[PDB]
Coordinates of C-alpha atoms (C1' of nucleotides) in Angstrom, one line a residue:
Chain A
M1 CA 27.6 -4.8 13.1
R2 CA 25.0 -7.5 12.8
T3 CA 21.6 -8.1 11.1
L4 CA 18.5 -7.9 13.2
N5 CA 15.5 -9.7 11.7
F6 CA 12.1 -8.9 13.2
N7 CA 9.7 -11.7 12.5
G8 CA 6.2 -11.5 14.0
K9 CA 2.5 -10.9 13.6
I10 CA 0.3 -7.9 13.4
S11 CA -3.2 -8.2 14.9
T12 CA -5.8 -5.6 13.9
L13 CA -7.9 -4.3 16.8
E14 CA -9.8 -2.3 14.2
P15 CA -10.2 -2.7 10.4
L16 CA -7.1 -1.9 8.5
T17 CA -7.3 -0.1 5.2
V18 CA -5.1 1.7 2.7
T19 CA -5.9 3.6 -0.5
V20 CA -3.6 2.9 -3.5
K21 CA -4.1 4.6 -6.8
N22 CA -3.8 1.5 -9.0
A23 CA -6.0 -0.7 -6.8
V24 CA -8.9 1.8 -6.4
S25 CA -10.9 1.4 -9.6
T26 CA -14.1 3.3 -10.6
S27 CA -16.1 0.2 -9.7
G28 CA -15.1 0.4 -6.1
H29 CA -12.4 0.6 -3.5
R30 CA -10.1 -2.4 -3.1
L31 CA -7.0 -3.3 -1.1
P32 CA -3.8 -4.0 -3.0
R33 CA -3.8 -7.4 -4.7
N34 CA -1.1 -9.5 -6.3
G35 CA -3.4 -10.4 -9.2
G36 CA -7.1 -10.5 -9.8
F37 CA -10.1 -9.9 -7.6
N38 CA -9.8 -13.5 -6.3
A39 CA -6.3 -13.1 -5.0
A40 CA -5.6 -12.4 -1.4
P41 CA -4.9 -8.8 -0.6
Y42 CA -2.0 -7.4 1.4
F43 CA -1.1 -4.3 3.4
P44 CA 1.8 -2.5 1.6
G45 CA 5.1 -2.5 3.3
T46 CA 5.5 1.0 1.9
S47 CA 2.8 2.3 4.2
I48 CA 4.3 0.6 7.3
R49 CA 7.7 2.0 6.3
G50 CA 6.3 5.5 6.0
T51 CA 4.6 5.2 9.4
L52 CA 7.7 3.9 11.1
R53 CA 9.9 6.5 9.4
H54 CA 7.6 9.2 10.7
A55 CA 7.9 7.6 14.1
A56 CA 11.7 7.7 13.9
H57 CA 11.6 11.3 12.8
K58 CA 9.4 12.2 15.8
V59 CA 11.9 10.4 18.0
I60 CA 14.7 12.5 16.6
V61 CA 12.6 15.7 17.0
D62 CA 11.9 14.9 20.6
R63 CA 15.5 14.0 21.3
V64 CA 17.0 17.1 19.8
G65 CA 14.4 19.3 21.5
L66 CA 13.6 22.9 20.7
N67 CA 15.7 26.0 20.6
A68 CA 15.7 28.7 23.3
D69 CA 13.0 30.6 21.4
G70 CA 11.0 27.4 21.2
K71 CA 11.3 27.0 17.5
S72 CA 12.4 23.6 16.1
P73 CA 16.1 23.6 15.1
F74 CA 15.4 22.0 11.8
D75 CA 14.7 24.1 8.7
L76 CA 12.8 23.0 5.6
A77 CA 15.9 21.4 4.0
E78 CA 16.8 19.3 7.0
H79 CA 13.1 18.5 7.6
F80 CA 12.8 17.0 4.1
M81 CA 16.1 15.2 4.4
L82 CA 14.8 13.4 7.5
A83 CA 11.2 13.0 6.4
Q84 CA 11.2 12.3 2.6
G85 CA 14.9 11.7 2.0
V86 CA 15.1 14.4 -0.8
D87 CA 17.7 17.1 -0.8
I88 CA 16.0 20.3 -1.9
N89 CA 18.9 22.7 -2.0
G90 CA 21.5 20.4 -3.6
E91 CA 23.8 20.6 -0.6
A92 CA 23.9 16.9 0.1
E93 CA 27.0 14.8 -0.3
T94 CA 27.2 13.0 -3.6
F95 CA 29.1 9.8 -3.1
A96 CA 30.9 8.1 -5.9
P97 CA 28.7 5.5 -7.5
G98 CA 31.4 2.8 -7.5
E99 CA 31.6 2.0 -3.8
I100 CA 28.9 0.4 -1.7
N101 CA 30.1 1.2 1.8
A102 CA 29.7 4.9 1.4
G103 CA 28.6 7.6 3.8
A104 CA 30.2 5.9 6.8
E105 CA 30.7 9.2 8.5
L106 CA 27.1 10.3 7.6
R107 CA 25.7 7.0 8.8
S108 CA 27.6 7.4 12.1
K109 CA 26.4 10.9 12.7
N110 CA 22.8 10.6 11.5
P111 CA 21.1 7.3 12.6
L112 CA 17.8 8.1 11.0
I113 CA 19.4 8.6 7.5
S114 CA 21.4 5.4 8.1
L115 CA 18.2 3.4 9.0
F116 CA 15.9 4.9 6.4
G117 CA 18.1 6.1 3.6
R118 CA 18.2 9.2 1.5
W119 CA 18.6 9.7 -2.2
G120 CA 22.2 8.5 -2.8
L121 CA 22.5 6.5 0.4
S122 CA 20.8 3.1 0.8
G123 CA 18.9 2.5 4.0
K124 CA 19.5 -0.3 6.4
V125 CA 15.9 -0.8 7.4
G126 CA 13.8 -3.2 5.4
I127 CA 10.1 -3.3 6.2
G128 CA 8.0 -6.0 4.5
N129 CA 4.4 -6.3 3.7
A130 CA 1.7 -7.5 6.2
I131 CA 0.5 -10.7 4.5
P132 CA -2.8 -12.1 5.9
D133 CA -2.9 -15.6 7.4
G134 CA -6.5 -16.6 6.8
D135 CA -8.6 -16.6 3.7
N136 CA -11.6 -14.5 4.6
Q137 CA -9.9 -11.8 6.7
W138 CA -11.0 -8.8 4.5
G139 CA -14.4 -7.2 4.0
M140 CA -16.2 -4.2 2.7
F141 CA -16.3 -2.0 5.8
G142 CA -17.2 1.7 6.1
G143 CA -20.2 2.4 3.9
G144 CA -23.1 4.3 5.5
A145 CA -25.0 7.1 4.0
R146 CA -25.0 10.9 4.7
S147 CA -28.4 12.1 5.7
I148 CA -30.1 15.5 6.2
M149 CA -29.9 16.6 9.9
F150 CA -33.3 18.3 9.7
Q151 CA -35.2 15.4 8.0
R152 CA -34.0 13.0 10.7
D153 CA -34.4 14.9 13.9
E154 CA -37.5 17.2 13.9
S155 CA -36.5 19.0 17.1
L156 CA -33.7 20.7 15.1
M157 CA -36.3 22.6 13.1
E158 CA -37.4 24.5 16.2
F159 CA -33.9 26.2 16.2
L160 CA -34.2 27.5 12.6
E161 CA -35.8 30.8 11.9
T162 CA -38.3 31.3 9.1
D163 CA -35.8 32.5 6.5
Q164 CA -33.5 29.6 7.3
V165 CA -36.4 27.1 7.0
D166 CA -37.2 28.7 3.6
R167 CA -33.5 28.3 2.6
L168 CA -33.6 24.6 3.6
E169 CA -36.8 24.0 1.6
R170 CA -35.1 25.7 -1.4
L171 CA -32.0 23.5 -0.9
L172 CA -34.1 20.3 -0.8
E173 CA -36.0 21.3 -3.9
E174 CA -32.9 22.1 -5.8
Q175 CA -31.3 18.9 -4.8
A176 CA -34.2 16.8 -6.0
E177 CA -34.4 18.7 -9.4
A178 CA -30.6 18.4 -10.0
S179 CA -30.8 14.7 -9.0
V180 CA -33.5 14.0 -11.6
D181 CA -31.7 16.0 -14.4
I182 CA -28.3 14.4 -13.7
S183 CA -30.0 11.0 -13.7
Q184 CA -31.4 11.7 -17.1
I185 CA -28.0 12.8 -18.4
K186 CA -26.3 9.7 -17.0
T187 CA -29.0 7.6 -18.6
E188 CA -28.3 9.1 -22.0
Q189 CA -24.5 8.7 -21.4
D190 CA -25.0 5.0 -20.5
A191 CA -27.1 4.5 -23.6
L192 CA -24.2 5.9 -25.6
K193 CA -21.8 3.6 -23.8
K194 CA -23.8 0.5 -24.6
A195 CA -23.8 1.2 -28.3
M196 CA -20.2 2.3 -28.2
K197 CA -18.9 -1.2 -28.6
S198 CA -21.2 -1.8 -31.5
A199 CA -20.1 1.5 -33.0
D200 CA -17.9 1.6 -36.1
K201 CA -14.3 2.7 -36.0
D202 CA -15.1 6.1 -37.5
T203 CA -18.0 6.5 -35.0
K204 CA -15.5 5.8 -32.1
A205 CA -14.6 9.5 -32.0
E206 CA -17.9 11.5 -31.9
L207 CA -19.5 9.1 -29.4
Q208 CA -16.7 9.9 -27.0
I209 CA -17.2 13.5 -28.0
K210 CA -20.9 13.4 -27.0
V211 CA -19.9 11.6 -23.8
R212 CA -17.5 14.4 -22.9
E213 CA -20.0 17.1 -23.7
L214 CA -22.6 15.3 -21.6
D215 CA -20.0 15.3 -18.7
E216 CA -19.6 19.0 -18.9
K217 CA -23.3 19.4 -19.1
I218 CA -23.5 17.6 -15.8
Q219 CA -20.8 19.9 -14.5
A220 CA -22.7 23.0 -15.7
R221 CA -26.0 21.6 -14.2
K222 CA -24.3 21.2 -10.9
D223 CA -22.9 24.7 -11.3
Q224 CA -26.4 26.1 -11.9
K225 CA -27.3 25.0 -8.3
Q226 CA -27.4 27.9 -5.9
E227 CA -28.2 26.7 -2.3
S228 CA -25.7 23.8 -2.5
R229 CA -23.4 22.6 -5.3
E230 CA -23.5 19.1 -3.9
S231 CA -26.4 16.9 -2.9
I232 CA -26.3 16.6 0.9
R233 CA -28.0 13.2 1.0
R234 CA -25.8 10.6 -0.7
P235 CA -24.7 7.0 -0.3
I236 CA -21.2 6.7 1.1
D237 CA -19.1 4.2 -0.8
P238 CA -17.6 1.4 1.4
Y239 CA -13.9 0.8 1.6
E240 CA -12.3 -2.6 1.7
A241 CA -10.3 -3.4 4.8
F242 CA -8.9 -6.2 6.9
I243 CA -11.4 -7.4 9.5
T244 CA -11.0 -6.8 13.2
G245 CA -8.8 -9.4 14.8
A246 CA -7.0 -10.3 11.5
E247 CA -3.6 -11.9 11.9
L248 CA -1.0 -10.5 9.4
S249 CA 2.5 -11.9 9.1
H250 CA 5.1 -9.1 9.2
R251 CA 8.9 -9.3 8.5
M252 CA 11.3 -6.5 9.2
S253 CA 15.1 -6.3 9.1
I254 CA 18.0 -4.0 9.8
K255 CA 21.1 -4.7 7.7
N256 CA 24.5 -4.2 9.4
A257 CA 22.9 -2.6 12.5
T258 CA 25.1 -0.8 15.0
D259 CA 23.8 -0.6 18.5
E260 CA 22.8 3.0 18.0
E261 CA 20.8 2.5 14.8
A262 CA 19.1 -0.5 16.2
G263 CA 18.4 1.5 19.4
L264 CA 16.8 4.3 17.3
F265 CA 14.7 1.7 15.6
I266 CA 13.5 0.1 18.9
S267 CA 12.8 3.6 20.2
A268 CA 10.7 4.3 17.1
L269 CA 8.7 1.1 17.7
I270 CA 8.3 2.2 21.3
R271 CA 7.0 5.6 20.3
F272 CA 4.9 4.0 17.5
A273 CA 3.0 2.1 20.2
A274 CA 1.5 5.3 21.7
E275 CA -0.7 5.6 18.5
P276 CA -0.2 2.3 16.7
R277 CA -2.3 2.8 13.6
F278 CA -1.5 2.2 9.9
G279 CA -3.5 3.3 6.9
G280 CA -6.3 5.7 6.8
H281 CA -10.0 6.2 7.5
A282 CA -9.0 7.1 11.1
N283 CA -12.5 8.7 11.5
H284 CA -13.7 5.1 12.0
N285 CA -10.7 4.4 14.2
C286 CA -9.4 2.2 11.5
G287 CA -5.8 1.0 11.4
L288 CA -5.2 0.4 15.1
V289 CA -3.0 -2.7 15.5
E290 CA -1.1 -4.7 18.0
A291 CA 2.1 -6.5 17.0
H292 CA 4.7 -8.7 18.5
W293 CA 8.1 -9.2 16.8
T294 CA 10.7 -11.8 17.6
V295 CA 14.0 -10.0 17.2
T296 CA 16.6 -12.4 15.9
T297 CA 20.1 -12.3 14.4
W298 CA 22.5 -14.6 12.5
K299 CA 25.0 -16.6 14.5
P300 CA 28.5 -15.4 13.5
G301 CA 30.3 -17.6 11.0
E302 CA 27.3 -19.9 10.2
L303 CA 23.8 -19.8 8.8
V304 CA 22.0 -20.4 12.1
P305 CA 19.5 -17.8 13.5
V306 CA 20.0 -16.6 17.1
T307 CA 17.0 -15.2 19.1
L308 CA 17.9 -12.0 20.8
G309 CA 14.6 -11.1 22.4
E310 CA 11.0 -10.1 21.6
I311 CA 9.0 -6.9 21.2
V312 CA 5.3 -7.0 22.1
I313 CA 3.1 -4.0 21.4
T314 CA -0.3 -4.2 23.1
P315 CA -2.9 -1.6 24.2
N316 CA -1.8 -2.2 27.7
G317 CA 1.9 -1.4 27.2
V318 CA 5.1 -2.3 25.4
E319 CA 7.1 -5.3 26.6
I320 CA 10.8 -5.4 25.5
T321 CA 12.3 -8.8 26.4
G322 CA 16.0 -9.5 25.9
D323 CA 19.1 -7.9 27.4
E324 CA 20.5 -7.1 24.0
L325 CA 17.5 -5.0 23.0
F326 CA 17.9 -2.9 26.2
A327 CA 21.6 -2.6 25.4
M328 CA 20.7 -1.2 22.0
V329 CA 18.2 1.3 23.4
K330 CA 20.6 2.4 26.1
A331 CA 23.4 2.8 23.5
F332 CA 21.1 5.1 21.5
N333 CA 20.1 7.1 24.5
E334 CA 23.6 7.6 25.7
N335 CA 25.2 8.7 22.4
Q336 CA 26.3 12.4 22.4
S337 CA 27.7 12.7 18.9
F338 CA 24.6 12.6 16.7
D339 CA 24.1 15.7 14.4
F340 CA 20.9 15.5 12.4
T341 CA 21.5 19.0 10.8
Chain B
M1 CA 33.1 -26.5 -2.6
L2 CA 30.7 -29.2 -1.6
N3 CA 28.4 -31.9 -3.0
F4 CA 26.3 -29.7 -5.2
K5 CA 23.2 -31.1 -6.9
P6 CA 20.8 -29.3 -9.3
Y7 CA 17.7 -28.0 -7.6
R8 CA 14.6 -26.0 -8.6
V9 CA 13.2 -23.5 -6.1
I10 CA 9.5 -22.5 -6.4
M11 CA 8.2 -19.7 -4.2
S12 CA 4.7 -18.2 -3.9
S13 CA 4.6 -14.6 -5.0
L14 CA 2.8 -12.3 -2.6
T15 CA 3.6 -8.9 -4.1
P16 CA 4.1 -7.6 -7.7
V17 CA 7.6 -8.0 -9.0
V18 CA 9.5 -5.0 -10.5
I19 CA 12.1 -6.1 -13.1
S20 CA 15.1 -3.8 -13.6
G21 CA 15.4 -4.5 -17.3
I22 CA 17.2 -7.8 -16.8
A23 CA 15.3 -10.6 -15.0
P24 CA 16.5 -11.1 -11.4
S25 CA 18.9 -14.0 -11.0
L26 CA 18.9 -16.3 -8.0
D27 CA 22.6 -15.7 -7.3
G28 CA 21.7 -12.0 -6.7
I29 CA 19.1 -12.9 -4.1
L30 CA 21.6 -15.3 -2.4
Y31 CA 24.2 -12.6 -2.5
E32 CA 21.9 -10.2 -0.7
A33 CA 21.0 -12.9 1.8
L34 CA 24.6 -13.6 2.5
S35 CA 25.4 -9.9 2.7
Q36 CA 22.9 -9.8 5.5
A37 CA 24.0 -13.1 7.2
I38 CA 27.7 -12.2 6.9
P39 CA 27.7 -8.8 8.5
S40 CA 29.8 -7.5 5.6
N41 CA 29.2 -5.6 2.4
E42 CA 32.6 -6.3 0.8
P43 CA 31.9 -8.1 -2.5
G44 CA 35.0 -10.2 -2.1
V45 CA 33.9 -11.7 1.2
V46 CA 30.3 -12.4 0.2
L47 CA 31.4 -13.9 -3.1
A48 CA 33.9 -16.1 -1.3
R49 CA 31.1 -17.4 0.9
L50 CA 28.6 -17.5 -1.9
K51 CA 30.8 -20.0 -3.7
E52 CA 30.4 -22.4 -0.8
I53 CA 26.7 -22.7 -1.4
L54 CA 26.3 -22.0 -5.2
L55 CA 28.3 -23.8 -7.9
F56 CA 30.6 -21.3 -9.7
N57 CA 31.3 -21.9 -13.4
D58 CA 34.8 -20.7 -14.0
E59 CA 34.7 -21.0 -17.7
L60 CA 31.8 -18.6 -18.1
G61 CA 32.4 -16.7 -14.8
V62 CA 28.8 -17.0 -13.8
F63 CA 27.1 -18.8 -10.9
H64 CA 24.9 -21.8 -11.7
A65 CA 21.8 -19.8 -10.8
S66 CA 19.0 -19.2 -13.3
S67 CA 17.1 -16.0 -13.8
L68 CA 13.5 -15.4 -12.7
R69 CA 10.7 -17.4 -14.5
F70 CA 7.1 -16.7 -13.6
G71 CA 5.0 -19.8 -12.8
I72 CA 1.4 -19.4 -14.1
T73 CA -1.5 -21.6 -13.0
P74 CA -4.7 -22.0 -14.9
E75 CA -6.3 -20.0 -12.1
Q76 CA -4.0 -17.0 -12.5
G77 CA -1.5 -15.9 -15.2
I78 CA 1.1 -13.3 -15.6
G79 CA -0.5 -9.9 -15.0
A80 CA 0.3 -6.2 -15.4
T81 CA 0.5 -4.0 -12.3
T82 CA 2.2 -0.8 -11.2
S83 CA 4.4 -0.2 -8.1
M84 CA 3.1 3.0 -6.5
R85 CA 5.3 5.1 -4.3
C86 CA 4.2 8.5 -3.1
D87 CA 5.1 11.2 -0.6
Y88 CA 2.5 11.5 2.1
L89 CA 3.0 15.0 3.6
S90 CA 0.7 14.7 6.6
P91 CA -0.3 17.6 8.8
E92 CA 2.3 16.3 11.3
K93 CA 5.0 16.7 8.7
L94 CA 3.8 20.1 7.7
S95 CA 3.8 21.4 11.3
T96 CA 6.0 23.8 13.3
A97 CA 6.5 21.1 15.9
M98 CA 8.9 19.4 13.5
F99 CA 10.6 22.3 11.7
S100 CA 10.6 26.1 11.7
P101 CA 9.3 27.4 8.4
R102 CA 10.4 30.7 6.9
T103 CA 8.0 33.5 7.9
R104 CA 6.6 36.4 5.9
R105 CA 4.2 38.8 7.5
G106 CA 4.1 36.3 10.3
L107 CA 2.5 33.8 8.0
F108 CA 4.4 30.5 7.3
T109 CA 5.5 30.0 3.7
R110 CA 3.7 27.0 2.5
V111 CA 5.5 24.0 0.9
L112 CA 5.1 24.1 -2.8
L113 CA 3.8 20.6 -3.5
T114 CA 2.7 20.7 -7.1
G115 CA 6.3 21.0 -8.3
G116 CA 9.8 21.9 -7.5
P117 CA 12.4 20.4 -5.1
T118 CA 9.6 19.8 -2.6
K119 CA 6.9 18.1 -4.8
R120 CA 4.8 15.0 -3.9
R121 CA 6.7 12.4 -5.9
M122 CA 4.2 10.1 -7.6
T123 CA 6.8 7.5 -8.7
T124 CA 5.3 4.5 -10.5
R125 CA 7.0 1.5 -12.1
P126 CA 5.7 -1.5 -14.1
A127 CA 5.3 -4.6 -12.1
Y128 CA 4.3 -8.2 -12.8
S129 CA 2.0 -10.3 -10.7
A130 CA 2.1 -14.1 -11.1
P131 CA 1.1 -16.9 -8.7
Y132 CA 4.6 -18.5 -8.5
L133 CA 8.3 -17.6 -9.0
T134 CA 10.8 -20.2 -10.1
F135 CA 14.6 -20.4 -10.1
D136 CA 17.0 -23.2 -11.0
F137 CA 20.4 -23.6 -9.3
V138 CA 23.1 -26.0 -8.4
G139 CA 24.1 -25.8 -4.7
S140 CA 23.4 -26.7 -1.1
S141 CA 19.6 -27.1 -0.6
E142 CA 19.9 -26.5 3.1
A143 CA 21.8 -23.2 2.9
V144 CA 19.5 -21.9 0.2
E145 CA 16.4 -22.9 2.1
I146 CA 17.7 -21.1 5.2
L147 CA 18.7 -18.0 3.4
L148 CA 15.5 -17.7 1.4
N149 CA 13.3 -18.4 4.5
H150 CA 15.1 -16.2 7.0
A151 CA 16.9 -13.4 5.2
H152 CA 15.3 -10.2 4.1
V153 CA 15.3 -10.8 0.4
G154 CA 12.7 -10.6 -2.3
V155 CA 12.5 -11.3 -6.0
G156 CA 12.9 -8.2 -8.1
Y157 CA 13.8 -4.6 -7.5
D158 CA 14.0 -2.7 -4.2
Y159 CA 12.5 -5.3 -1.9
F160 CA 14.2 -3.6 1.0
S161 CA 12.3 -0.3 0.7
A162 CA 9.1 -1.0 -1.3
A163 CA 8.8 -4.7 -0.3
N164 CA 8.2 -5.6 -4.0
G165 CA 8.5 -9.3 -4.8
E166 CA 7.6 -10.6 -1.3
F167 CA 7.4 -14.4 -1.4
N168 CA 6.8 -17.3 1.0
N169 CA 6.3 -21.1 0.9
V170 CA 9.8 -21.6 -0.6
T171 CA 9.8 -25.1 -2.1
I172 CA 13.0 -26.7 -3.3
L173 CA 12.8 -29.9 -5.4
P174 CA 15.7 -31.7 -6.9
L175 CA 16.2 -31.8 -10.7
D176 CA 17.7 -34.3 -13.1
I177 CA 19.4 -32.0 -15.5
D178 CA 21.3 -28.8 -14.7
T179 CA 19.0 -26.1 -16.3
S180 CA 20.7 -23.2 -14.5
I181 CA 22.7 -21.7 -17.4
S182 CA 21.8 -23.3 -20.7
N183 CA 18.8 -25.2 -22.1
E184 CA 18.6 -26.3 -25.7
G185 CA 21.2 -23.6 -26.6
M186 CA 19.3 -20.7 -25.1
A187 CA 20.8 -18.8 -22.2
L188 CA 18.8 -19.0 -19.0
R189 CA 20.9 -16.3 -17.3
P190 CA 23.2 -13.4 -18.1
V191 CA 26.2 -15.2 -19.7
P192 CA 29.1 -13.9 -21.7
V193 CA 28.4 -13.2 -25.3
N194 CA 31.3 -15.5 -26.4
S195 CA 29.6 -18.5 -24.6
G196 CA 27.7 -19.3 -27.8
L197 CA 24.3 -19.1 -26.1
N198 CA 21.3 -17.4 -27.7
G199 CA 19.3 -14.7 -26.0
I200 CA 18.7 -10.9 -25.8
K201 CA 21.9 -9.0 -26.0
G202 CA 22.7 -6.5 -23.2
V203 CA 25.3 -5.0 -21.0
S204 CA 25.6 -6.1 -17.4
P205 CA 28.0 -7.6 -14.9
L206 CA 28.3 -11.4 -14.6
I207 CA 28.6 -11.8 -10.8
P208 CA 26.6 -10.0 -8.1
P209 CA 26.0 -7.4 -7.0
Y210 CA 24.8 -6.5 -10.5
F211 CA 25.0 -2.7 -9.9
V212 CA 28.7 -2.8 -9.2
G213 CA 31.6 -3.6 -11.6
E214 CA 32.4 -3.2 -15.2
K215 CA 29.5 -4.0 -17.5
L216 CA 30.4 -6.5 -20.2
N217 CA 28.5 -7.4 -23.3
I218 CA 26.3 -10.3 -22.1
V219 CA 23.5 -12.4 -23.5
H220 CA 20.5 -12.8 -21.3
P221 CA 17.0 -14.5 -21.6
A222 CA 13.8 -12.5 -22.0
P223 CA 13.1 -10.6 -18.8
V224 CA 9.5 -12.0 -18.5
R225 CA 9.3 -15.7 -19.1
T226 CA 6.3 -17.8 -18.0
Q227 CA 6.0 -21.6 -17.5
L228 CA 3.0 -23.6 -16.3
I229 CA 3.3 -24.6 -12.7
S230 CA 2.3 -28.1 -13.6
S231 CA 5.3 -28.3 -15.9
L232 CA 7.6 -26.8 -13.4
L233 CA 6.7 -29.3 -10.7
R234 CA 7.5 -32.2 -13.1
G235 CA 11.3 -31.9 -12.5
Chain C
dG1 C1' 13.4 47.0 -6.0
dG2 C1' 14.7 42.9 -6.0
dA3 C1' 12.7 39.7 -3.2
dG4 C1' 9.9 36.5 -1.6
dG5 C1' 5.5 34.6 -2.0
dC6 C1' 1.0 33.5 -4.0
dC7 C1' -2.4 32.3 -8.1
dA8 C1' -3.8 31.2 -13.0
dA9 C1' -2.5 29.4 -17.3
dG10 C1' -0.8 26.2 -20.8
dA11 C1' -2.4 20.7 -25.9
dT12 C1' -6.0 17.0 -25.3
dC13 C1' -7.6 12.8 -23.3
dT14 C1' -7.1 8.0 -20.3
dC15 C1' -11.3 1.0 -20.7
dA16 C1' -9.9 -3.4 -16.8
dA17 C1' -14.0 -4.6 -14.2
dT18 C1' -17.6 -10.1 -9.0
Chain D
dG1 C1' -42.6 -62.5 54.6
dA2 C1' -43.0 -66.4 49.9
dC3 C1' -45.9 -64.6 44.2
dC4 C1' -48.7 -63.2 40.1
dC5 C1' -49.0 -59.6 35.9
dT6 C1' -48.2 -54.5 33.3
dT7 C1' -53.7 -53.5 27.7
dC8 C1' -56.2 -52.0 23.4
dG9 C1' -56.9 -46.7 19.3
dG10 C1' -58.7 -43.2 17.1
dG11 C1' -57.4 -39.0 14.4
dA12 C1' -54.1 -34.7 12.8
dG13 C1' -56.9 -29.2 9.5
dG14 C1' -58.3 -25.4 6.5
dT15 C1' -56.4 -18.5 4.7
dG16 C1' -54.7 -14.4 3.7
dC17 C1' -51.1 -11.3 2.2
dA18 C1' -45.6 -10.1 0.9
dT19 C1' -45.0 -2.1 0.3
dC20 C1' -43.4 2.5 -0.9
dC21 C1' -37.4 6.2 -1.8
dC22 C1' -33.8 8.9 -1.6
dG23 C1' -29.2 9.8 -3.7
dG24 C1' -23.7 8.5 -5.3
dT25 C1' -18.5 14.2 -4.1
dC26 C1' -14.5 17.2 -4.1
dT27 C1' -7.4 16.6 -5.2
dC28 C1' -3.1 15.5 -6.9
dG29 C1' 1.6 14.7 -7.7
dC30 C1' 4.4 20.9 -13.3
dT31 C1' 6.7 25.1 -14.5
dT32 C1' 6.6 30.0 -15.1
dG33 C1' 5.2 34.6 -15.4
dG34 C1' 2.1 38.5 -13.5
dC35 C1' 1.4 40.8 -9.6
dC36 C1' 1.1 42.1 -4.3
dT37 C1' 3.4 43.7 -0.6
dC38 C1' 8.0 43.3 2.2
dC39 C1' 12.7 44.1 4.0

DNA sequence: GGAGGCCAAGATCTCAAT
DNA sequence: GACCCTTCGGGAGGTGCATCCCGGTCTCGCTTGGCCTCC
């Protein structure tokens, strides 16, 4: 029973990005910000927590193994209890709200639910945000522009037959016509928008009405298209991300960690290192990181930190330093009482 | 029980703060920090230690620890943001390598994600984004410095899971007047209604953890208060 | 023949932008 | 094998010409009944 504080850094080998609903406006894609567009962004601790919870779930799945028939021994209910923390059938224990140290038996039997809680049981694992260190460590990556594979490489036309070439020509013509028509409709809509502010309070309704009707006219115009509903050639919008080699401060903790729960957490971090990526846009290999955490605890009876070791995750391997951490991992590996069902 | 002097703590806010109706108080943060430092969750033990680093007002039954007050600069002021939490059911989660789905005609019954017990939960909460967060207290500056810098505590709601209210650059500067409970007759923290202090009426415990214990009729300040950072540093 | 499962249907509309 | 004595100056430009175009997406966070096959 002790608190294990993980203080360290996260270095991005590749750009690190995340899509959040309230941060992604119609003007563009942005990282989460604690304020305006001039504030420094951050990588949410919710995303890191989700990635590490999935890693711990994978550790549990590997440990438990598969049944004789080869099917996983977890059904949907247990899967959602371990993954999302919801109870879908109402069969979960409902502890009394008064007490705090509740679920002692459940925390002893299911280390994953103890670390990352469920609804009705608080979790011992706190995972903080990844706050950048510098001041220009974010940029508009991605971007690009989808092209037409036959207007770029002429050798590909030799493969097409005559009917397919005719189909391609029809597709290009339809794309151009629809582009022009939709541009005209958008021009009219924007003209409405500019005079919308100058419009009177009574006029505030029917101008929005015409904007709406223009929108469904765009939709119907795109529906009229036959060869393709969407224009193949299009600019790709860039996504904001942390630059390569950005240093992000990360803080993680386990509150009242037994050796088994801390061992499960260390094992999750070990398994996380096989594919250590956060966030999305994995098609551009984004999210790949390397991190080193200084595992420390509190000296019993006084407010003095005690360093127990260090965990370093690199593309070349995982380095666990400190006899205490190995003791935690061994304690998790040797326990024979866990029941995750 | 120590030489306690009035201090003002100013921290830089890194993440939007979610306020659970009543503004977070510094004694709550210190209670969580001590619950992590002391490997104990018993309220009696943590409160017994918390009284060694925060002055306890016996007459009112509350710690000399003010509530949250956002510090606004001319560059950035108090803003409105939402705390977004979602279920990301990846192809790995929806895979037979993790669980065995129920089978009909050999096909696997898909998870109903638009609604039900197994829906993607798009839980969103109001949050506030300001450059600085400020608390007033009377206690040991060293212990509070250590707890704020090294413990896993934030300002607001559910910092453990969502990491809302992440802060850094904790600055503690001594004060001249104890402005931790009262100031010009207005309560700066949840105080008993009979204290004679003005503020918004409400029902809440007086000592942390504020989710545990009988909820008495209290008087607390407005949940969202802002002060200029220049006027906060004046001391 | 419930019983599992899918799919379509239900009101009107949301301004912030280096 | 002893030591003088180390230069002056002229003279530095002018011109054109500065392009055309595409093409900007799809979801979704709810519940229920109607209906298709299934055990």
